[PDB]
């Protein structure tokens, strides 16, 4: 069924009929698929790395693989061919996939000309490292962020808000000059520009309807938000059963 269409093409089509109720859900969470379908799906699937059980993590990795390959094959390109869509999954799989840590450049300037997509990629890479623990993954992500900061000085100031606490803690205690070097380069570029306005800050994502990408992928809570967004979920499910049954 995905031979003639992209994952967004199929999946965002059966929701359009009841997009009215679902829109409230997206606004409530901060996962506006209509803005960035692939990035919203990646943002959802990101908790897989945070799951307690080691088995669910491996599935999360497959699920991306299957998403990325399906997306790439739709444009008739290489599996690891960096593009607008493939950017998110390539970023997510980078920390785990060895064949993705080899074929990455990642921060393409000719392709990632859109400020928003670059901003989302930066935010995802930042969230993937804020809760991360792996030292090798931290080094890889830090190096990618450093390369991007040079490549994308304009947007790097917006994604630094979440990275602030982690950098401050690391810059005070962490004693890996290999890791510290990219952090130092990032700090240097941050000190360089002092012109970006609030539209080049968090509000850029927050007005792109993706404010929760820095909050969603966090640790699993304890039975708190279950009742909160259940109201839309129940209504959404009722609507889904109404139009298709």
């Amino acid at each position: 069924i995905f031979n003639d269409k992209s994952p967004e093409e199929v999946f965002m089509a059966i929701r359009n009929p009841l997009e009215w109720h679902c829109k409230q859900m997206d606004h409530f969470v901060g996962l506006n698929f209509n803005s960035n379908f692939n990035f919203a799906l990646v943002g959802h699937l990101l908790k897989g790395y945070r799951h307690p059980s080691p088995a669910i993590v491996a599935r999360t990795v497959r699920i991306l693989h299957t998403l990325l390959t399906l997306v790439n094959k739709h444009r008739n390109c290489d599996k690891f061919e960096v593009n607008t869509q493939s950017v998110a999954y390539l970023a997510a799989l980078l920390t785990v996939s060895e064949e993705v840590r080899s074929r990455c450049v990642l921060l393409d300037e000719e392709v990632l000309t859109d400020p928003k997509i670059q901003a989302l990629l930066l935010t995802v890479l930042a969230t993937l490292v804020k809760y991360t623990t792996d030292e090798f993954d931290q080094r890889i992500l830090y190096e990618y962020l450093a390369e991007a900061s040079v490549v994308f000085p304009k947007v790097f100031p917006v994604v630094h808000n979440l990275l602030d606490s982690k950098i401050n803690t690391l810059l005070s205690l962490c004693q890996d000059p290999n890791l510290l070097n990219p952090i130092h380069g990032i700090v240097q570029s941050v000190v360089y520009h002092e012109e970006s306005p609030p539209q080049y800050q968090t509000s850029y994502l927050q007005s792109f309807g993706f404010n929760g990408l820095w909050r969603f992928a966090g640790p699993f809570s304890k039975q708190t938000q279950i009742p909160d967004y259940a109201e839309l979920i129940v209504k959404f499910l009722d609507a889904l059963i109404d139009t298709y049954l």
């Binding site: 808000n161 810059l171 005070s172 890996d176 800050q201």
Partner: protein, 236 residues
């Protein structure tokens, strides 16, 4: 927002933790990169970096060191601090125009000269580092140093154990042809109504200040003998 300042402050705290005075090789591999941090920061932070370094040095200068190894640790901590400051000032372009660092230079008068005020072996290394620091300062904030020298000369002319301190600073001030001519003029309209000790101190400053001018600029000296300068000749 305004987080870059916070990071600059965090790196400053990193210096505050890597000092040999408190620590007593964890801050050997990273500290070198952690000091190259501020060294590069001075090219961009400029005044903020100078302020942080000056505060760190003044805290170093304002110390007790009651024991024995404490002075040994400080002898290295302040030496590294001075080396880093001198490197930062040398790296910083002259286009920064650090006139707003007038207060910083005033603090350095008690900080960069925290040991050379009294001027009484690590003392020699500190003196060399402070001479380099003052030389770097002269390349940008020459005006503040000359103003301090002129104020000291005016104060000492009216006035005795020693007061050539803050008046003999010309000994390490980076001299220049026009700067040397101005210094000669200022000393000329001070010399007659001056203390004999003050006159000797001015003389001692001027001889090797001229030596400094020759060494730093071995082009102006040949120019003086090539194309005559009436003002310099009259002052001489």
């Amino acid at each position: 927002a305004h987080r870059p300042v916070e990071w600059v402050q965090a790196v400053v705290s990193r210096f505050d933790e890597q000092l040999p005075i408190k620590t007593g090789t964890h801050t050997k591999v990273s500290t070198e990169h952690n000091k190259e941090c501020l060294i590069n920061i001075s090219k961009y932070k400029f005044s903020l970096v100078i302020s942080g370094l000056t505060t760190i040095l003044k805290n170093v200068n304002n110390m007790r060191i009651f024991g024995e190894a404490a002075e040994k640790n400080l002898y290295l901590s302040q030496l590294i601090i001075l080396d880093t400051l001198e490197k930062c000032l040398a790296g910083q372009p002259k286009d920064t125009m650090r006139l707003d660092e007038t207060m910083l230079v005033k603090q350095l008068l008690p900080e960069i000269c925290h040991f050379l005020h009294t001027c009484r072996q690590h003392a020699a290394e500190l003196r060399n580092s402070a001479s380099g620091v003052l030389f770097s300062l002269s390349c940008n904030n020459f005006n503040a140093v000359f103003s301090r020298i002129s104020t000291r000369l005016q104060e000492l002319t009216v006035c005795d154990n020693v007061d050539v301190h803050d008046i003999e600073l010309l000994q390490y001030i980076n001299v220049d042809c026009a700067k040397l001519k101005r210094l000669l003029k200022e000393t000329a309209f001070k010399f007659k109504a001056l203390k004999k000790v003050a006159q000797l101190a001015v003389i001692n400053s001027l001889e090797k200040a001229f030596w400094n001018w020759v060494e730093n600029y071995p082009d102006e000296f040949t120019k003086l003998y090539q194309i005559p300068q009436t003002d310099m000749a009259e002052c001489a």
